[PDB]
């Protein structure tokens, strides 16, 4: 029996049943098997969560045509030593990894096709953010906890991403009022989910006004830890005819009673108001507004690739075929 | 119920860990890290600027924090 006559497509069909390490093993059989093990059709989805690897390797794997790359909490703490051509990657999670600014720039400078990206928790730079603006098809972008970039770089990025649906731009700790003002004045009008929590004094009521004026389609709006927002801003939320999910946790100057107003928003479904309801009164708020779910979501899902059901290895609903489990 | 460790530093960061009781611990995400809004929502109380920067997988009830010096 000769298996050398068996067509390429059928070997690819057999290879596609192999787990990642098994696939790499069989590349060391012959020049033909080696060619086909790196095909394309086999490398569409890749999960290297928590992996310690040289960035030259990740560049090489991406050059094989990866479409979805799940690689959060990884370690790529070595400098790039190779050059790469444009990647096809459309979905990528690098959040909370150990990776230098230059390495991150090397990878992202070759990306123009991203639809979904998370860089949550990573130090960035102006060149990084500027190079991100190549990805004008971005639908979901997570830059939560990111830093190292100016409001000028932010503006370019936001102006480019004119079809953005979800933006998590929260807890960018080095933000000034310039960044916040650029954010509200430059986010795409198309945005339906915005997390702009964590700016405290640097986010003013007028910023909310700008936002609501510019972005009428907001469904999720998270403005947790925004001390400047009180009940005098509440009429702004009534301008949002699609608002379903509002968060105003630790907006300390809100009198608990006034939250009753938000019960008048016809489309509202849930409300997060952690830290501002006096102990022993929460059930009063809940029973006063029984059409709402109140303080039941501690966590944001906005531009988050992977959430809930305690295992979940999917990246924006995509299960990765190649994995180290 | 929630234990807050003492802080130590290197040339760059200050570090603390937080030990959660079983009831709060069961809410801790497995698939991402918590922003300050998120860990405050959970009931964790500390100063500003602490970042939940890694998951200690062997002990999910222990939260690792750091902040720039």
């Amino acid at each position: 029996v000769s298996w050398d006559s068996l067509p390429d497509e059928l070997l690819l069909g057999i290879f596609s049943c192999l787990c990642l390490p098994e696939l790499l093993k069989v590349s060391g059989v012959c020049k033909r098997w080696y060619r086909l093990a790196s095909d394309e059709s086999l490398w569409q989805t890749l999960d290297l969560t928590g992996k310690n690897l040289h960035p030259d390797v990740t560049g090489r794997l991406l050059s094989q045509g990866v479409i979805a790359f799940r690689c959060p909490r990884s370690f790529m703490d070595q400098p790039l030593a190779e050059h790469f051509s444009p990647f096809r990657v459309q979905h990528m999670d690098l959040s909370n990894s150990v990776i230098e600014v230059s390495t991150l720039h090397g990878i992202l400078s070759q990306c123009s096709k991203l639809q979904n990206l998370s860089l949550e928790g990573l130090r960035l730079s102006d060149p990084i953010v500027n190079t991100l603006a190549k990805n004008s098809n971005l639908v979901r972008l997570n830059l939560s906890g990111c830093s190292g970039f100016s409001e000028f770089a932010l503006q370019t990025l936001l102006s480019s991403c004119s079809r953005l649906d979800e933006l998590n731009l929260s807890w960018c700790f080095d933000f000034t009022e310039k960044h916040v003002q650029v954010a509200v004045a430059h986010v795409s009008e198309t945005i339906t989910q915005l997390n702009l929590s964590g700016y405290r004094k640097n986010l003013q009521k007028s910023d909310l006004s700008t936002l609501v004026r510019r972005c009428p389609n907001l469904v999720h709006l998270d403005l947790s830890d925004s001390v400047m927002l009180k009940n005098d801003c509440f009429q702004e939320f009534f301008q949002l005819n699609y608002l379903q999910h509002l968060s105003l946790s630790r907006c300390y100057d809100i009198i608990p009673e006034t939250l009753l107003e938000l019960g008048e928003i016809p489309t509202l479904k849930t409300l997060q108001v952690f830290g501002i309801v006096p102990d022993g009164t929460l059930q009063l708020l809940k029973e006063a507004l029984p059409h709402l779910q109140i303080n039941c979501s501690h966590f944001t899902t906005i531009a988050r690739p992977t959430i809930g059901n305690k295992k979940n290895q999917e990246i924006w609903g995509i299960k990765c075929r190649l994995t180290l489990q | 119920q929630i234990y807050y460790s003492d802080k130590y530093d290197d040339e760059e960061f200050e570090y603390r860990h937080v030990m959660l009781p079983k009831d709060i611990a069961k809410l801790v995400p497995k698939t991402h890290l918590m922003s300050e809004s998120e860990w405050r929502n959970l009931g964790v109380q500390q100063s500003q600027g602490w970042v939940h920067y890694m998951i200690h997988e062997p002990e999910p009830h222990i939260l690792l924090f750091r902040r720039p010096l």
Binding site: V227, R250, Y252, D253, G275, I276 | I2, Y4, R40, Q45, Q46, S47, Q48
Partner: peptide, 10 residues
């Protein structure tokens, strides 16, 4: 700006 954000005392 009510409620102080700090670590509880030992």
């Amino acid at each position: 700006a009510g409620s102080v954000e700090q670590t509880p005392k030992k």
